[PDB]
Design a protein around this ligand. Structure first.
Ligand SMILES: N#Cc1ccc(N2CCCOCC2)cn1
Ligand SMILES: N#Cc1ccc(N2CCCOCC2)cn1
Lengths: 304, 304
């Protein structure tokens, strides 16, 4: 029993983190096979970041200008290339700790673990969601760029995020491991405002199921609703529209608890309209949206 | 910027987790040097757990009855002994992945990371606090016993918790790595009720400092208070008394922010008396108490 915001065990990723230095800029790289992946802005000064021309900046860089350190041992850079917003540094040694891995581009509402790193050294692990506005709400200080987000399925790490930038609102933006930003963000120090941070409705419902499984049941009511009726309320409260695909994804939790998805929607509707009245659900005073239906099943079933 | 509930990177601990089986009971063990540490209730059936005599049960057990598996490789048990509520299984092989480590017995209010495991395999990592009633609010299913709690200082793991039991209220109890329960709990399936789960005041204040550092400042008011005045309010709200030792520990956060500790206490006092009025602090609708002053400095400074 109990339900926690749980990250994946970080060891397989810790084994991949390196330090990348270009001139006076140090950040983190991801060492998989004989390639080190890092944000391309490693080549920028803070001055450069106001209006950088990455192709032009990169012309002035040679393999030997990229200092790659794995623990206290230096890696030999034998090639470099830019792919979108990441650099790929080819090194002469395959990472002996390379796990089974994939690169995946996640959808908004999907959760992942972040291994926050500085100077190639892990500092902490926490759980994030890709927000519907394609920001994440992370914990990243200067030096944390190149820290990565991942999921694990048994022994395969799926890398989905690399940390690039903080917006003036203190929310975070980054790329997949092909170097494509999530959302409209760019690796430039300019006016980039996030859109509406809507609530991930399917995740709230999952978490309400988690609450029922773990004994928090006070919010269950006598009502039901329809997708269209629920969605009128969702819209009013800046919740994502609930689709039949979302209903289908909650089916296993519905089956386990015997609470019809539309009945849980009617519980959520009353919580949106009435608030918590000073009560808590799974130790939270607000409706938590950074657990996916898959997360809730995983944690409630003890998957390793 | 940003402030997250962050666990320590779990890799050093993942490298220590094994499976222990005695008869039909499987749980987790901690493999450090040539000793595997696990809950003594590994020797119990569910029937035994109602009124177990561990010394009597252990007489019927030999080294070969303790099946210890590290990944898919079996360890040879060459000795066993009971220390308080843990068994120490001596194996013929030192764990080659043994990190620098210590065993520490933490005080209530101290935080730590839990690596939740099943069958010796890591499933997730999350941050806990030792509650003032010596319970923790974890996420543990059957098979999770022997999962451990730890802190890391650079390259030294300090192990502070081993998971033993869930109370009927769905809160958790366990031991330090000398096998001594935190609080009054016993490894028996009996009536064990937790006392008052008071709020860890020094941790709330730390987190309010974290909020100020990270731009959440709406709750700062024009007031101050005294320890005695604050403590009258703390008592009324089931907060731990604030001591001068706590004030001293918040000194660095006070210095960094320029907000006198007693001024932050007066902010907390108004939040206790007035509530949040539907506002949030660092994404929370309640006052968070599972960050220590050390946690806040660590996360706000990027310690690795
Ligand atoms: N947000 C953001 C941000 C700010 C500065 C920055 N630069 C390159 C990497 C670090 O070196 C200093 C300049 C990158 N990203
Ligand atoms: N809370 C609790 C609890 C419940 C059962 C239990 N036993 C020994 C280990 C697992 O085997 C089944 C019996 C131990 N702890």
């Amino acid at each position: 029993s109990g339900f926690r915001k749980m990250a994946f065990p970080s060891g397989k990723v810790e084994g991949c983190m390196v330090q990348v230095t270009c001139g006076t800029t140090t950040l983190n790289g991801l060492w998989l096979d004989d390639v080190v992946y890092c944000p391309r802005h490693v080549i920028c000064t803070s001055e450069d970041m106001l209006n950088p021309n990455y192709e032009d900046l990169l012309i002035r860089k040679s393999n030997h200008n990229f200092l790659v350190q794995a623990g206290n041992v230096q890696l030999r850079v034998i090639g470099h290339s830019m792919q979108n917003c990441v650099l790929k540094l080819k090194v002469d040694t395959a990472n002996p700790k390379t796990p089974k891995y994939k690169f995946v581009r996640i959808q908004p509402g999907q959760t992942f673990s972040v291994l926050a790193c500085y100077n190639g050294s892990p500092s902490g692990v926490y759980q994030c969601a890709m927000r519907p506005n394609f920001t994440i709400k992370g914990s990243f200080l200067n030096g944390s760029c190149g820290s990565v987000g991942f999921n694990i399925d048994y022994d395969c790490v799926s890398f989905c995020y690399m940390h690039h930038m903080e917006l003036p609102t203190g929310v975070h933006a980054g790329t997949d491991l092909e170097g494509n930003f999530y959302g409209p963000f760019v690796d430039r120090q300019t006016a980039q405002a996030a859109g509406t941070d809507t609530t991930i409705t399917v995740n709230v419902l999952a978490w309400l199921y988690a609450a029922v499984i773990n004994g928090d049941r006070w919010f269950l009511n006598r009502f039901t609703t329809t997708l269209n009726d629920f969605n009128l309320v969702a819209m009013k409260y800046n919740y994502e529209p609930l689709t039949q695909d979302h209903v289908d994804i909650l089916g296993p939790l519905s089956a386990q608890t015997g609470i019809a998805v539309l009945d849980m929607c009617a519980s959520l509707k009353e919580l949106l309209q009435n608030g918590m009245n000073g009560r808590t659900i799974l130790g939270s005073a607000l409706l938590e949206d950074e657990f996916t239906p898959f997360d809730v099943v995983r944690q409630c079933s003890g998957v390793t």
